[PDB]
């Protein structure tokens with residue numbers, strides 16, 4: 053199962069591009085799941101149908117679902133209630149929790165959205181959510197809360213390690229920790245399935261496996277989108293390009309989405325080397341004709357690109373000159389801050405409100421001497 | 437301190453409206469803070485200035501900050517390292533945590549955004565974050581992650597009280613709770629009484645902030661739409677309903693356009709409606725022209741007047757619960773009863789809202805009828 057998502061400013065065509073992509077992949081023979089996690093009614097208009105928590109099959113290959121956190125939070129509570137019935141740790145307090153009454157709090161949308169995607173795509177383990185034919189989906193297209201939140205998920209796998217290690221330290225090297233951690237570890241074990249020091253090691257390995265997949269381009273694919281007629285939309289795309297790099301990933305292409313009744317202009321100059329394409333999806337009052345849209349010659353390019361991408365570098369090291377070349381589109385030198393908290397072993401990059409640790413090879417290891425921003429790449433010279 | 441935010445679909449003029457409002461309030465003499473929590477460069481083009489974590493003063497009354505979770509997390513960690521040194525709860529382990537190395541994970545943007553806004557507005561407690569004159573801001577304008585996430589923030593105070601009840605139970609009615617809760621309640625204290633006092637005061641502090649988030653003199657939300665995009669207008673009606681479901685209210689609706697050229701004032705009755713014309717050119721924006729434009733007099737007046745509160749109505753005679761539910765269809769509104777006939781749970785817009793029914797109205801749902809945009813629920817005894 054592969055994962056596809058669209059990144060861009062509000063009004064840049066993300067939702068339009070997500071539905072277009074889902075229709076294209078389904079028409080092409082791929083079992084496709086379009087996942088919506090928001091309250092924007094645009095998708096329902098584009099699809100010509102109301103979508104809900106239960107899958108809606110547009111055709112035999114296009115399944116659409118709306119995630120609802122009110123419903124998603126119920127399953128974890130049910131599992132926790134099952135564990136407490138075996139361990140009686142809460143003296144029945146958990147059993148009295150009416151999950152059907154609980155409201156959605158800040159942060160819950162992002163966290164539960166991330167949990168459902170794991171079941172659908174299978175980043176950290178094999179996917180468990182199957183399509184209506186009992187098999188796993190071929191493509192998962194995700195139209196999420198926001199570009200910035202989607203980016204927290206893309207780069208999630210790499211950055212969990214340090215959190216888990218600090219948490220293990222607080223569990224195994226503190227009074228209250230050695231007191232609580234035992235039972236908590238026993239409860240999370242029961243709740244998940246149907247010794248403590250050892251439970252922490254397996255967890256760390258399970259985290260490492262998730263970074264191999266989320267990094268694997270044969271699992272995740274990101275596309276930039278922009279309204280070609282809005283200068284702010286184009287500029288935001290370039291910014292989100294660098295935010296994607298800073299998340300630890302890459303962009304697979306850039307699209308100019310025109311939902312108006314005009315031919316889609318292409319501002320292809322600023323986004324090379326990315327493959328560029330445009331799409332014309334007019335918002336007709338009588339309902340979209342997807343047969344016509346998908347067959348329009350103007351969309352032939354984007355359709356090919358989409359299929360070639362699912363069909364199948366940010367750092368370049370120079371061992372001789374002691375250099376780390378960091379591609380940083382959408383950023384200015386002033387916005388990129390370099391830190392070193394682990395000696396010459398690693399280099400931390402701070403930009404776009406995200407931190408990225410770049411472990412340095414033996415030859416490059418050292419302290420930062422200077423840096424220069426040429427074009428859109430920062431050349432960092434190391435000193436030994 | 438007052439709070440202002442704009443709700444609408446992507447590309448509907450939210451950020452444009454927020455910068456317009458910030459300029460208007462500062463010009464009216466109010467100490468204004470424009471808070472941006474996202475990586476969208478649009479605000480900088482609109483303001484004509486780079487924005488960062490440190491405040492940028494467009495004028496003596498207009499401060500602009502971009503929040504950054506990487507930085508927002510460091511200071512709270514510092515406060516937690518102090519309490520650990522005193523109470524010795526972690527035995528120096530917390531002191532070894534390198535906040536400056538940690539990456540932002542899913543959910544942290546929302547949590548830390550919510551914390552910073554509390555310091556700036558002071559809904560639960562008195563505002564802590566002061567302007568450059570050492571005084572609380574008069575107006576906080578928030579342009580956040582997304583409309584949906586901002587609605588989770590608007591509803592927090594009304595929906596935590598249930599979570600807090602269950603957490604107090606786990607702390608006072610379980611063996612692990614009775615053993616650890618006392619120590620944990622102390623550590624929280626210093627970081628910022630008796631444990632039962634703490635819980636009792638928390639529950640008061642929670643309802644104190646829910647009253648502030650319901651106060652029209654402290655919180656104002658506005659719908660924005662592009663009047664030439666039907667999806668933008670429909671989205672505004674939907675987020676109106678989501679605001680009601682969050683436990684709050686909308687104070688007005690704005691049609692933002694980049695030109696002076698079919699406003700849907702009638703579709704948003706009884707909200708005060710106004711249009712706004714914010715022309716822009718690549719060279720930048722002429723805010724003196726935009727703010728003196730007579731086409732923008734109405735939006736400026738509506739912003740200045742503010743600086744439906746009742747969405748649930750009870751009829752003790754006919755035994756009815758009338759729910760203002762704009763933007764929803766009868767099929768998108770679910771009504772559940774988990775406490776017998778004493779309560780009514782409304783599920784809509786991926787949010788739940790609990791209505792405690794007056795003793796007279798109490799009973800079981802026996803019919804619902806959508807009238808205009810109000811759901812009339814007949815309660816059967």
Ligand SMILES: CCCCCCCCCCCCCC(=O)OC[C@H](COP(=O)([O-])O)OC(=O)CCCCCCCCCCCCC
Pocket residue numbers: 127128129131132157158159160163167240243244543547599
């Ligand atoms: C200001 C508002 C703050 C809100 C902060 C964000 C809260 C969201 C936390 C939700 C995480 C719940 C745990 C979870 O979903 O894991 C699911 C896990 C996987 O099961 P499976 O399907 O793979 O067999 O199966 C399980 O059931 C794991 C159960 C063990 C972990 C329980 C953690 C409970 C967290 C709830 C916290 C609520 C805070 C208000």
Ligand SMILES: [Mg+2]
Pocket residue numbers: 063064065066067068069094
């Ligand atoms: Mg769109």
Ligand SMILES: [Mg+2]
Pocket residue numbers: 447448449450451452453478
């Ligand atoms: Mg805008």
